Amino acid sequence: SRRRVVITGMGMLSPLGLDVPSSWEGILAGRSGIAPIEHMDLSAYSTRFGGSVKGFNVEEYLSAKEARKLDLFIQYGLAASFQAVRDSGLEVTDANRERIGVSMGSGIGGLTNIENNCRSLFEQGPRRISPFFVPGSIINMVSGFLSIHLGLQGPNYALTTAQTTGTHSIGMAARNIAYGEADVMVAGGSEMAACGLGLGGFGAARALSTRNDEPTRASRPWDRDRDGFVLSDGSGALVLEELEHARARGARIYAELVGFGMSGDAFHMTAPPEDGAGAARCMKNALRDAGLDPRQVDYINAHGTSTPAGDIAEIAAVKSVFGEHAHALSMSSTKSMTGHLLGAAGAVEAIFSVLALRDQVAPPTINLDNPDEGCDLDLVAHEAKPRKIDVALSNSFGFGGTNGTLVFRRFA
Amino acid sequence: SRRRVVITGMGMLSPLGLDVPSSWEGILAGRSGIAPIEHMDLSAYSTRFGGSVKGFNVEEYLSAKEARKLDLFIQYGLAASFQAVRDSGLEVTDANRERIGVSMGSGIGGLTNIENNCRSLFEQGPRRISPFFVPGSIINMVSGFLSIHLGLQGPNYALTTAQTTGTHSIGMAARNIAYGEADVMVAGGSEMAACGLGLGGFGAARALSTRNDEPTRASRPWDRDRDGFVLSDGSGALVLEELEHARARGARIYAELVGFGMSGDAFHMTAPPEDGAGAARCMKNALRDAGLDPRQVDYINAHGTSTPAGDIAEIAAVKSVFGEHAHALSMSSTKSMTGHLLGAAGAVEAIFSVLALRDQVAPPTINLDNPDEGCDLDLVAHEAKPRKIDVALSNSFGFGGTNGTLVFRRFA
Ligand SMILES: O=C(c1ccc2c(c1)OCO2)N1CCCCCC1
Numbered sequence: 001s002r003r004r005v006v007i008t009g010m011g012m013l014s015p016l017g018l019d020v021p022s023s024w025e026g027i028l029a030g031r032s033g034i035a036p037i038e039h040m041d042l043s044a045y046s047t048r049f050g051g052s053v054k055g056f057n058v059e060e061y062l063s064a065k066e067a068r069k070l071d072l073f074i075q076y077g078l079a080a081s082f083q084a085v086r087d088s089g090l091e092v093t094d095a096n097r098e099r100i101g102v103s104m105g106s107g108i109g110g111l112t113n114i115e116n117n118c119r120s121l122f123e124q125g126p127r128r129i130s131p132f133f134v135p136g137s138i139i140n141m142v143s144g145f146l147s148i149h150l151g152l153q154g155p156n157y158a159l160t161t162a163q164t165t166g167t168h169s170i171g172m173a174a175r176n177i178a179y180g181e182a183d184v185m186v187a188g189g190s191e192m193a194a195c196g197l198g199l200g201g202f203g204a205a206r207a208l209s210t211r212n213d214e215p216t217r218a219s220r221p222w223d224r225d226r227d228g229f230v231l232s233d234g235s236g237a238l239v240l241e242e243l244e245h246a247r248a249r250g251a252r253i254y255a256e257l258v259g260f261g262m263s264g265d266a267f268h269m270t271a272p273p274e275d276g277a278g279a280a281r282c283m284k285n286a287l288r289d290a291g292l293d294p295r296q297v298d299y300i301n302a303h304g305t306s307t308p309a310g311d312i313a314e315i316a317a318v319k320s321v322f323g324e325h326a327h328a329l330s331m332s333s334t335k336s337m338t339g340h341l342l343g344a345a346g347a348v349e350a351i352f353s354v355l356a357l358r359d360q361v362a363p364p365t366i367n368l369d370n371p372d373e374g375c376d377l378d379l380v381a382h383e384a385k386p387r388k389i390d391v392a393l394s395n396s397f398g399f400g401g402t403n404g405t406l407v408f409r410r411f412a
Numbered sequence: 413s414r415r416r417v418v419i420t421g422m423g424m425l426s427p428l429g430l431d432v433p434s435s436w437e438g439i440l441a442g443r444s445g446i447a448p449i450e451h452m453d454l455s456a457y458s459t460r461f462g463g464s465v466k467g468f469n470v471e472e473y474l475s476a477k478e479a480r481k482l483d484l485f486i487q488y489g490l491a492a493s494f495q496a497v498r499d500s501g502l503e504v505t506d507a508n509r510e511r512i513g514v515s516m517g518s519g520i521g522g523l524t525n526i527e528n529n530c531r532s533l534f535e536q537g538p539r540r541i542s543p544f545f546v547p548g549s550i551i552n553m554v555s556g557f558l559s560i561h562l563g564l565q566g567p568n569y570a571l572t573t574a575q576t577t578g579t580h581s582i583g584m585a586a587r588n589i590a591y592g593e594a595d596v597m598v599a600g601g602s603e604m605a606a607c608g609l610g611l612g613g614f615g616a617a618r619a620l621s622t623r624n625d626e627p628t629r630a631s632r633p634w635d636r637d638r639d640g641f642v643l644s645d646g647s648g649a650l651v652l653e654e655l656e657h658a659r660a661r662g663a664r665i666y667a668e669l670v671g672f673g674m675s676g677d678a679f680h681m682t683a684p685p686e687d688g689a690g691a692a693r694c695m696k697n698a699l700r701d702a703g704l705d706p707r708q709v710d711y712i713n714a715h716g717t718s719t720p721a722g723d724i725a726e727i728a729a730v731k732s733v734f735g736e737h738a739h740a741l742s743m744s745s746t747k748s749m750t751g752h753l754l755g756a757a758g759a760v761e762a763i764f765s766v767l768a769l770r771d772q773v774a775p776p777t778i779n780l781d782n783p784d785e786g787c788d789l790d791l792v793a794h795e796a797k798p799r800k801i802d803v804a805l806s807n808s809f810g811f812g813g814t815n816g817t818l819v820f821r822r823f824a
Contacts, residue, residue, distance in 0.1 A: 044537045044538055044539070045538050097678070098675070098693065101674070101676065102676075107550065108546075108550065109521075109572075111526075114523075114526055114609065115526075115530065115533075117609060117612075117613065118526065118527060118530035118534075118609060119530070119534060121527075121608045121609060121612055122530065122531065122534055123534075125456045126456050126457050126608055126611065126612035126615060126616070127456060127616075129608075129609070129612040129613055129615070129616040130616060131616040131617045131618075132617075133609075133612075133613045133616060133617075134520075134613045134614060134617065134811070135617075135681050135682065135811050135812075138519065138520060138572070138574055138811065139551070139572040140519075140572055140573045140574045140576075140810065140811065140812055140814060141574075141681075141811060141812050143573075143676075143812060143814065144574075144681070144811055144812015144813065144814060145681075145812065147676040147677075147678045147812060147813065147814075148678055148679070148680070148681070148812070148813065150678075151678045152676055152678055153675055153676045153677070153678045153690070153693065154674075154675070154676060155674040155675075155676075156573070156674065156675070156676035156812065156813070156814040156815075157571060157573045157576075157580055157584075157674070157814065158571065158572050158573060159569055159570065159571060159572075160517075160521075160550070160551040160552055160570050160571075160572045161552045161555075161568075161569050161570055162550055162552050168569055172569075172584070175587075175591070179587070179591060181587075181674065196533050196538060197526065197529060197530065197533060197541070197545070199538070200533060200538030200541040200545075201529070201541050201542075201545040201546045201549075202546060203538060203541070204538070204539075204541040204542060204543045204545055205543045205544075205545075205546060205547075206543075207546075262513075262567045262568065262569065262593075263510070263565055263566075263567075263568070264513065264514070264555075264556075264559040264564055264565050264566065264567075264568030265559075265560075265565075266509070266559045266560050266562075266563045266564055266565050267560065268560065269481075269547045269553070269556060269557065269560065270547050278565070281510065281565065398552070399546070399547050399550060399552065399553065399556060400547075400552045400553055400555055400556020400557070400559065400560075400568065401556060401559060401560060401568065402552060402555070402556065402568045402569065403568075
């Protein structure tokens with residue numbers, strides 16, 4: 001029968017910090033992680049800025065010899081996973097290693113590595129493709145390499161659901177534990193799509209903000225002057241654990257994961273429906289899963305991408321699901337500060353939702369100078385809002401009309 | 413408790429055929445789908461052959477205009493998915509669309525699209541990258557496009573576990589139905605990695621057979637002269653359905669999906685442990701999941717990739733799990749004929765496992781001319797073997813030591 005699932009460890013790389021606490025301090029201070037990209041010449045690109053991880057030292061985690069064969073998305077996913085496992089205080093033994101698994105996903109995986117091996121193929125030939133190219137680039141190898149480093153022999157998989165990846169990864173890892181397939185899962189996502197193909201590919205869809213002359217103001221969810229999402233890099237990992245397992249070992253419990261929803265829009269390859277119908281179905285699934293009155297929801301970490309159609313669809317979905325209570329909860333987009341970490345967005349935002357519960361504060365939506373038509377909820381404009389939060393919801397939406405919602409609550 | 417899951421529809425593209433019955437006819441006749449790769453200068457490559465899909469007409473499924481937006485691996489996944497849904501007779505309605513979902517995956521995704529967009533980027537700059545580059549290349553677009561075309565609003569996701577993808581996709585879709593999150597799922601995988609990057613990538617790791625003079629003899633699982641896997645393309649999709657739902661509409665039921673196992677080796681990146689300890693745990697997990705004793709297994713569709721280390725690990729795992737029954741079961745690698753479809757391998761091999769149950773026949777392991785040291789099981793060398801089959805296992809093992817097993821049983 002279905003077991004309860006709690007969060008006992010968290011790990012992060014984001015454009016605001018090389019761990020959770022440093023990232024969270026930036027979130028609560030309303031700091032932007034967005035800046036002109038230094039790692040490549042983007043003069044031919046319509047977008048030349050994003051959320052870079054700054055000063056990442058992979059030799060805090062792995063040998064340079066190993067790190068050199070891994071795409072950055074694997075490096076970031078391992079760093080976040082190592083932090084989460086250490087934060088959990090969990091000891092991996094012969095007695096429990098078969099009951100600990102990992103589900104770390106990515107939207108795009110090792111695009112930098114694929115682009116560099118494509119350059120080798122086209123400028124030289126197949127003889128110059130790295131032997132390490134495939135296992136160093138493909139999405140399942142955060143789960144793979146983490147399991148080899150820590151000796152995790154439980155369920156070992158990866159989701160790829162575009163911008164919903166991190167939320168689905170955490171939800172489905174919780175279902176694994178709920179249903180008895182595991183007692184512990186490391187779950188979340190990682191992304192590093194800031195290469196020529198990533199910036200040029202989102203650029204070709206005209207999906208990205210082009211505010212090159214003011215990058216910190218580019219990401220402006222629900223603002224009338226928003227012009228698309230800001231591409232960001234990083235990772236979030238959470239240790240999910242069966243409640244009685246966590247209680248038995250005296251674990252510090254951050255929060256309980258009480259609800260998970262998935263729904264497909266079945267609307268459009270890339271555009272969300274304006275009325276937010278799929279997001280509304282997804283949130284209702286999640287609230288019914290959690291056995292909640294919708295009025296119990298105090299805080300929503302929105303998807304909040306800073307796209308014209310996405311941001312307004314979310315307002316419509318929240319009004320539809322919550323009715324008059326839509327005016328009492330607080331909803332914010334931390335993408336205002338981090339930008340859009342794509343497959344890692346739902347992982348870092350799940351962490352921000354748990355910390356909103358720990359610290360009783362709604363992170364701000366920075367840059368919300370002029371809320372657009374109908375964006376008249378409490379969107380925590382400009383400054384963090386201390387408040388009562390018993391229940392926090394984290395939403396993600398992605399290409400393919402793929403939706404996820406996570407419901408977290410305080411554990412006493 | 414848990415609901416029962418049955419297979420009511422199947423669909424396939426493989427090196428043997430453009431549908432299930434044509435593919436299965438090749439399988440039972442011992443025919444190879446392997447040939448020199450055409451319309452591609454492989455002069456500089458150490459492998460010049462593989463399993464191509466021959467004569468695929470995407471316009472049976474999509475308009476030319478919608479097909480131009482999608483990588484071949486998405487086209488192949490949609491073809492298998494449309495076939496499977498047609499084969500099931502399912503009628504999607506407003507009353508059931510929220511109960512019908514998709515989990516179609518891929519191991520490597522849109523390499524061909526990436527390669528073609530790399531050409532444009534390097535030669536002409538980012539302004540020649542296609543606007544549909546991202547949504548036409550990412551792995552979750554089979555689930556995305558399928559849900560949009562058929563109006564499916566149930567769970568919408570995509571797994572990517574390298575060579576285990578199709579097995580895990582089907583298993584976790586089966587969990588969705590068993591635990592009441594959906595009544596119907598379309599599940600499986602698709603792959604088209606026959607580009608420079610895929611042949612070059614696996615070639616650089618020396619993972620591929622280089623038997624260019626005799627491509628049809630290259631894939632020779634458990635043969636002492638095997639020299640690596642054969643890269644192949646295609647797709648498999650199954651309609652998974654809750655039993656009472658299938659019975660109420662008078663569905664034709666092929667077989668029951670009774671067990672699903674997952675494990676991690678937590679051992680090696682590529683070469684599994686010689687004793688197949690991980691594959692043994694995974695198979696035991698699948699049988700415990702089905703409430704079956706190892707003695708009840710009749711037929712195993714091996715992973716059987718034709719790699720020195722892989723093939724021998726599976727012999728050890730089977731001897732370990734099955735003890736004095738290990739010789740009584742029949743175990744064959746249909747990769748001897750199809751080659752290795754990577755993320756679609758588990759999907760097409762679940763279909764061959766189902767059809768072994770329907771037709772009471774173990775497919776051959778062709779090219780098994782000289783069984784290697786210790787390869788003394790009933791590996792169905794050379795010719796199909798009619799026999800009693802009540803219970804059929806299908807195994808997949810992938811990069812990162814990620815394992816999957818499905819258990820299928822006759823239904824009547
Ligand atoms: O250092 C490596 C390694 C080897 C080859 C690789 C790679 C990493 O990434 C892509 O190609 N390993 C392999 C097993 C994982 C634990 C450390 C040892």
